[PDB]
Design a protein around this motif. Structure first.
Motif, PDB file in Angstrom:
ATOM      1  N   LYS A  34      41.731 -20.147 142.599  1.00  0.00           N
ATOM      2  CA  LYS A  34      42.492 -21.081 141.827  1.00  0.00           C
ATOM      3  C   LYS A  34      43.579 -20.347 141.023  1.00  0.00           C
ATOM      4  CE  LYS A  34      42.941 -24.026 137.858  1.00  0.00           C
ATOM      5  NZ  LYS A  34      42.500 -24.166 136.457  1.00  0.00           N
ATOM      6  N   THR A  35      44.822 -20.688 141.224  1.00  0.00           N
ATOM      7  CA  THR A  35      45.824 -20.121 140.426  1.00  0.00           C
ATOM      8  C   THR A  35      46.498 -21.314 139.723  1.00  0.00           C
ATOM      9  OG1 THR A  35      47.618 -20.351 141.924  1.00  0.00           O
ATOM     10  CG2 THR A  35      46.131 -18.519 142.320  1.00  0.00           C
ATOM     11  N   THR A  36      47.561 -21.029 138.980  1.00  0.00           N
ATOM     12  CA  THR A  36      48.283 -22.110 138.334  1.00  0.00           C
ATOM     13  C   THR A  36      49.117 -22.981 139.288  1.00  0.00           C
ATOM     14  OG1 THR A  36      50.138 -20.620 137.779  1.00  0.00           O
ATOM     15  CG2 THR A  36      48.370 -20.922 136.083  1.00  0.00           C
TER      16      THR A  36
ATOM     17  N   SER B 186      43.368  -7.030 142.681  1.00  0.00           N
ATOM     18  CA  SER B 186      43.470  -7.084 141.234  1.00  0.00           C
ATOM     19  C   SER B 186      42.735  -8.300 140.578  1.00  0.00           C
ATOM     20  CB  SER B 186      44.972  -7.091 140.947  1.00  0.00           C
ATOM     21  OG  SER B 186      45.668  -7.241 142.172  1.00  0.00           O
ATOM     22  N   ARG B 187      42.878  -9.458 141.202  1.00  0.00           N
ATOM     23  CA  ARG B 187      42.301 -10.654 140.669  1.00  0.00           C
ATOM     24  C   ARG B 187      40.853 -10.494 140.492  1.00  0.00           C
ATOM     25  NH1 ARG B 187      43.759 -15.947 140.286  1.00  0.00           N
ATOM     26  NH2 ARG B 187      45.681 -15.086 141.221  1.00  0.00           N
TER      27      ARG B 187
ATOM     28  N   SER C 155      44.811 -14.502 135.121  1.00  0.00           N
ATOM     29  CA  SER C 155      45.648 -15.103 134.084  1.00  0.00           C
ATOM     30  C   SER C 155      44.940 -16.326 133.502  1.00  0.00           C
ATOM     31  CB  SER C 155      47.039 -15.475 134.600  1.00  0.00           C
ATOM     32  OG  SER C 155      47.798 -14.317 134.833  1.00  0.00           O
ATOM     33  N   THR C 156      45.383 -16.745 132.360  1.00  0.00           N
ATOM     34  CA  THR C 156      44.702 -17.895 131.818  1.00  0.00           C
ATOM     35  C   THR C 156      44.904 -19.180 132.647  1.00  0.00           C
ATOM     36  OG1 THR C 156      44.050 -19.114 129.830  1.00  0.00           O
ATOM     37  CG2 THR C 156      46.361 -18.553 129.990  1.00  0.00           C
TER      38      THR C 156
ATOM     39  N   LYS D 143      37.624  -2.866 142.931  1.00  0.00           N
ATOM     40  CA  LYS D 143      38.656  -3.268 143.884  1.00  0.00           C
ATOM     41  C   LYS D 143      38.425  -2.774 145.276  1.00  0.00           C
ATOM     42  CE  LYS D 143      42.016  -2.170 141.098  1.00  0.00           C
ATOM     43  NZ  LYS D 143      43.474  -2.042 141.018  1.00  0.00           N
ATOM     44  N   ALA D 144      37.922  -1.553 145.416  1.00  0.00           N
ATOM     45  CA  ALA D 144      37.636  -0.939 146.725  1.00  0.00           C
ATOM     46  C   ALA D 144      36.484  -1.618 147.396  1.00  0.00           C
ATOM     47  CB  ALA D 144      37.257   0.495 146.524  1.00  0.00           C
ATOM     48  N   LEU D 145      35.513  -1.952 146.576  1.00  0.00           N
ATOM     49  CA  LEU D 145      34.357  -2.640 147.069  1.00  0.00           C
ATOM     50  C   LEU D 145      34.775  -3.954 147.667  1.00  0.00           C
ATOM     51  CD1 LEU D 145      31.876  -1.526 144.405  1.00  0.00           C
ATOM     52  CD2 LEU D 145      31.586  -1.210 146.849  1.00  0.00           C
TER      53      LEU D 145
END
Ligand SMILES: Nc1ncnc2c1ncn2[C@@H]1O[C@H](COP(=O)(O)OP(=O)(O)OP(O)(O)=S)[C@@H](O)[C@H]1O
Ligand SMILES: [Mg+2]
Length: 741
Positions: free
Chosen positions: A223-225, A260-261, A266-267, A417-419
Motif C-alpha cells: 500500500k502506498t499513497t 527499502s520498504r 512513509s506515513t 534487505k538482503a534476506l
C-alpha cells in the motif's frame, strides 16, 4: 451475437450507444468550434468557443463568457465535428490537436468507455470502479475478432497478439506501462486471463500460472499513497505455447524490488502485504511458534501509522496466499521456512542497539536477537558479533570492528534487505521451476513496469526506471517507423533518445553509470566526489545534462518525458549494495533449509563482481534483446486524477500523461502525414449523398470516391489515392464531413 445484439452488456459497457438512424443529416449543424484556454496560464484547461468569424489568416471566436477573441488560424485547436466524438480510434480524428485528443478520450470516459486506440496504442484510463467487462462471456466475444471488428479492449489486443503468433509464427510482446495506480497490473492479469482461456488445455498448469501472481503480489506489492496495491517491482511474464497454440509453460522475470520498504515506510503507507497477512492469518499456534504479535508490536510495521487497507482482510488474503503456494507446489516446509523468514526479519527489526560502554554498540536486551536467530536457525552470538563487531580487512589484517549504534543499525537493515530481496528472487526461481518450459515453441511476453517516474525526490532507482523508459520509447519510435513505412508502401502511397541513453549508459566517453561504477571502487569516495565528477564531465559539456544553480547534491537529465532532477545521496552504497561478510558467514550456516539457499547459491547470493548499475544495464539489454525478437503491442495506462476517484477525469493530470507517454508525439507525427486512411467503400457509404452523382453502394468505390471529391472540388494535395484506402491529410475529412447533402 452480442456484437450485433444492441441489448447485450457488450453493447452496454463497451460501445457508444446506437440509435435508430445513421443518417448523415442528424449531425448537421452550421456552427464551428475551437479549443481555447480561458486562462493562458493554465494551458490544459480549454473551453470550446464557437467561431464568430474569420480573416484571411485568423479566427475570431466567442468565449464561454460571451467574450470574443481572435486566433491565428495557424494556432487554432480546431474542434472535430461531433460525429467524431467517441470514435474508437483517435486515428480517425481529422483535427489532431491536444485538447481534441483529450476531448475524445473524455467523451468516451464519460460513458465509462475506458479503452481507446490511438494508432498503434491502446489507451486505457483507470475507471476507479468496477466495470463488468472481464467476464468469461466477455472473454468469449473477443475470440478471433479483428481489432476493427470489436470495441477497444485489453482482450482485443490479447486476441490480436495470439492470432499473430499462430499466424505469423512469431513471438509477441505486450508492453503495459504508465504511472502508479494507472492499472498496469490489472490489465496484465486480464491479458493472462484471457490467454489462459483462449489457449488453455480445455487446467493444472493454467492454474499454477494463475496462482503465481497472487504469490508475487504478497511479497512484492504494498500500500502506498498512490495505490492500495502497488507493485514495488517490475516484471516480464513469458507465456509459453506449443506449436499448436496451447499454453505450455511460463517464466517470470522480476526487476528493481523496493527492498527499502521493508525497513521503512512513509506515513500512511504499509510495508509489503505478507507481513500483515502473516500477522493476521497465522494460527494462534504458529504465532507462538513464531514469536508473533501485533503489527503495533513491530518497528518495521508500527511506524507509518497505517496497518490496514480499506476493505481488505489480511487474514483472508493470507489464506489465499497460502492457497496459491499450495497449488504452485510449495511444500509445507518451504512454506513454514518462508514464514519463518518473514518472521525473523520482523524480529531483526526489533533489535535495539544502545551505546554507553564507550562509542561501540551493545545489546543489553537480547530478546529480539534470540527470536530472529531462532527462526533463521543461525547462532545468536555469531549474529550478535557479525552485527556489532564485523571483521574487516585492512589489507593484510582481518580485524573485527566494533560498530557504533547507527552503523550497527544500518547493518541490521542491510541484513534484512538482503534476506527479503534474496527470498523474493528464490520465490521467483521456485515458481519458474515449476512453470517454465526449456523447450517451447512460441511465447507472448507481458511487461508490467512503470513508465517514466518524476517525483519530488528522484534517486538512483528513478534513474534506472527512467533509463529503461528511454529504451522502450526509442523501441516504440523505431517500430512506429517501420510500421508506418510498411503501410504507405502497401497502398502504393509515397537519436535524441540516443543522446540521453548515452549520457546514462555510455562507456567512452563515460556516462553517468560508468562514472558511478568508477567511484564505486574507492572505499573512501563520497556523494560529493561522485557528484563533482558528474558535473566535471557533463556540466555545459553534454546538452542533456544540467548542473543546478544552487543545489550541490542534484543534477538534471533531459529525458524524453522532459527534465528530471536526481539527487545523489547514497548512490555509492546503492551501487555496491554491501552486506558484511560475517553476516554472510553467519547465515550460510543456517540450519534452515531455505535460508541456506539464499546464502549458499551464487545465483541468489550474488550479482555475478558486478555493480548494481552494471547488473541493471545488463538486464535491460537482454530485455530489449528479447523484445527485438517479438512483434510488440503497446498499452498506455492513464490515471484520471491523483485521488483514486471515479468520474473525475482531470485534464492537467491526463494531458501530462499523454505528453510523457508518447501518445501525443505519435499523433503530432501521424498528423504531419496522412492521418485519416479510409476504406473506399466506407467513405462512399457515408458520403455518396454529397455528390450529385454517386450511389451509397457502388462496386467501383475508388471511382465513387473520386466522384464526391471531384464533386466537392477538393484539393489534390489534401488526399492520396491508396490501393485500398483513401489517405486524407489533417482537417480535410472534417471539412468534408462539414459539407451539404
Ligand atoms: N479496469 C479497471 N477496473 C477497475 N479498477 C481498475 C481497473 N484498472 C485498475 N483499476 C483500479 O486501480 C487500482 C490500481 O491499479 P493497478 O493495476 O494496481 O495500477 P498499476 O499501474 O499496476 O500501479 P503500480 O503498481 O503502483 S506502478 C486497482 O487495484 C483498481 O482499484
Ligand atoms: Mg502494478
Amino acid at each position: 451475437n452480442p456484437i450485433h445484439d444492441r441489448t447485450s452488456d457488450y453493447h452496454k459497457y463497451l460501445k457508444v450507444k446506437q440509435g435508430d438512424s445513421d443518417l448523415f443529416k442528424l449531425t448537421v449543424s452550421d456552427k464551428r468550434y475551437i479549443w481555447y484556454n480561458p486562462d493562458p496560464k493554465e494551458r490544459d484547461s480549454y473551453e470550446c468557443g464557437e467561431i464568430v468569424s474569420e480573416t484571411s489568416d485568423s479566427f475570431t471566436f466567442k468565449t464561454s463568457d460571451g467574450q470574443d477573441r481572435q486566433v491565428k488560424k495557424d494556432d487554432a485547436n480546431q474542434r472535430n465535428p461531433i460525429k467524431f466524438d467517441g470514435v474508437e480510434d483517435m486515428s480517425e480524428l481529422s483535427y489532431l490537436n491536444e485538447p481534441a485528443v483529450f476531448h475524445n478520450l473524455r467523451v468516451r470516459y464519460n460513458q465509462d468507455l475506458i479503452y481507446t486506440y490511438s494508432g498503434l496504442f491502446l489507451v486505457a484510463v483507470n475507471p476507479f470502479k468496477r466495470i463488468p467487462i472481464y467476464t468469461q462471456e466477455m472473454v468469449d466475444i473477443f475470440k478471433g475478432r479483428r481489432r476493427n471488428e470489436v470495441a477497444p479492449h485489453i482482450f482485443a489486443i490479447s486476441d490480436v497478439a495470439y492470432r499473430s503468433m499462430l499466424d505469423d509464427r512469431q513471438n509477441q510482446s505486450l508492453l503495459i506501462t504508465g504511472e502508479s495506480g494507472a492499472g498496469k497490473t490489472e490489465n496484465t492479469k486480464k491479458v493472462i486471463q484471457y490467454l489462459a482461456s483462449v489457449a488453455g488445455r480445455n487446467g493444472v498448469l493454467e492454474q499454477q500460472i494463475l496462482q503465481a501472481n497472487p504469490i508475487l503480489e504478497a511479497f512484492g506489492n504494498a500500500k502506498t499513497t498512490r495505490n492500495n496495491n502497488s507493485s514495488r517491482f517490475g516484471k516480464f511474464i513469458e507465456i509459453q505455447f506449443n506449436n499448436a497454440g496451447f499454453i505450455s509453460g511460463a517464466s517470470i522475470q522480476s526487476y528493481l524490488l523496493e527492498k527499502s520498504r521493508v525497513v521503512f515506510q512513509s506515513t500512511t503507507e504499509r510495508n509489503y502485504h505478507i507481513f500483515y497477512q502473516l500477522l493476521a492469518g497465522a494460527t494462534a499456534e504458529e504465532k507462538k511458534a513464531l514469536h508473533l504479535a501485533g503489527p503495533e508490536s513491530f518497528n518495521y510495521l508500527n511506524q507509518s501509522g497505517c496497518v490496514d487497507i480499506k476493505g481488505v482482510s489480511d487474514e483472508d488474503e493470507f489464506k489465499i496466499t497460502r492457497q496459491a503456494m499450495d497449488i504452485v507446489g510449495f511444500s509445507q516446509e518451504e512454506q513454514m521456512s518462508i514464514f519463518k523468514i518473514i518472521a525473523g526479519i520482523l524480529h531483526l527489526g526489533n533489535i535495539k542497539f544502545e551505546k554507553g560502554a564507550g562509542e561501540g554498540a551493545v545489546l543489553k536486551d537480547k530478546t529480539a536477537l534470540n527470536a530472529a536467530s531462532t527462526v533463521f536457525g543461525v547462532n545468536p552470538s555469531v549474529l550478535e558479533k557479525a552485527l556489532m563487531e564485523p571483521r574487516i580487512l585492512a589489507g593484510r589484517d582481518l580485524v573485527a570492528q566494533h560498530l557504533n549504534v547507527e552503523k550497527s543499525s544500518s547493518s541490521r537493515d542491510a541484513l534484512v534487505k538482503a534476506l527479503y530481496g534474496r527470498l523474493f528472487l528464490w520465490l521467483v526461481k521456485k515458481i519458474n521451476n515449476v512453470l517454465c518450459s526449456e523447450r517451447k515453441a512460441y511465447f507472448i511476453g507481458v511487461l508490467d513496469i512503470s513508465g517514466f517516474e518524476i517525483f519530488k525526490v528522484n534517486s538512483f532507482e528513478q534513474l534506472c526506471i527512467n533509463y529503461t523508459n528511454e529504451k522502450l520509447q526509442q523501441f516504440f519510435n523505431h517500430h512506429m517507423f517501420k510500421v508506418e513505412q510498411e503501410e504507405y508502401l502497401k497502398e502504393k502511397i509515397n537519436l535524441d533518445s540516443q543522446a540521453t541513453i548515452d549520457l546514462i549508459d555510455g562507456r567512452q566517453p563515460p556516462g553517468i553509470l560508468a562514472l558511478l561504477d568508477e567511484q564505486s571502487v574507492f572505499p573512501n569516495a563520497t556523494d560529493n566526489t561522485l557528484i563533482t565528477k558528474l558535473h566535471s564531465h557533463f556540466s555545459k559539456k553534454n546538452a542533456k545534462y544540467e548542473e543546478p544553480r544552487f543545489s550541490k547534491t542534484e543534477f538534471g537529465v533531459t529525458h524524453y518525458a522532459g527534465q528530471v532532477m536526481y539527487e545523489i545521496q547514497d548512490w555509492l552504497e546503492k551501487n555496491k549494495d554491501p552486506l558484511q561478510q560475517d553476516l554472510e558467514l553467519c547465515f550460510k550456516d543456517s540450519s534452515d533449509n531455505v535460508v541456506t539457499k539464499l546464502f549458499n547459491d551464487p545465483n541468489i547470493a550474488s550479482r555475478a563482481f558486478l555493480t548494481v548499475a552494471a547488473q541493471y544495464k545488463e538486464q535491460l539489454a537482454s530485455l530489449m534483446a528479447t523484445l527485438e525478437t517479438t512483434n510488440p503491442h503497446f498499452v498506455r495506462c492513464i490515471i484520471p486524477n491523483n485521488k483514486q476517484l471515479p468520474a473525475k477525469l482531470e485534464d492537467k493530470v491526463v494531458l501530462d500523461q499523454l505528453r510523457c507517454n508518447g501518445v501525443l508525439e505519435a499523433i503530432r507525427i501521424t498528423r504531419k502525414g496522412f492521418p485519416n486512411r479510409i476504406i473506399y467503400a466506407d467513405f462512399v457509404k457515408r458520403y455518396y449523398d454529397l455528390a450529385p452523382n454517386v450511389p451509397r453502394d457502388a462496386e467501383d468505390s475508388q471511382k465513387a470516391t473520386d466522384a464526391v471529391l471531384k464533386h466537392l472540388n477538393i484539393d489534390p494535395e489534401q488526399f492520396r489515392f491508396g490501393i485500398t484506402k483513401i489517405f486524407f491529410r489533417a482537417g480535410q475529412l472534417a471539412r468534408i464531413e462539414e459539407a451539404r447533402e
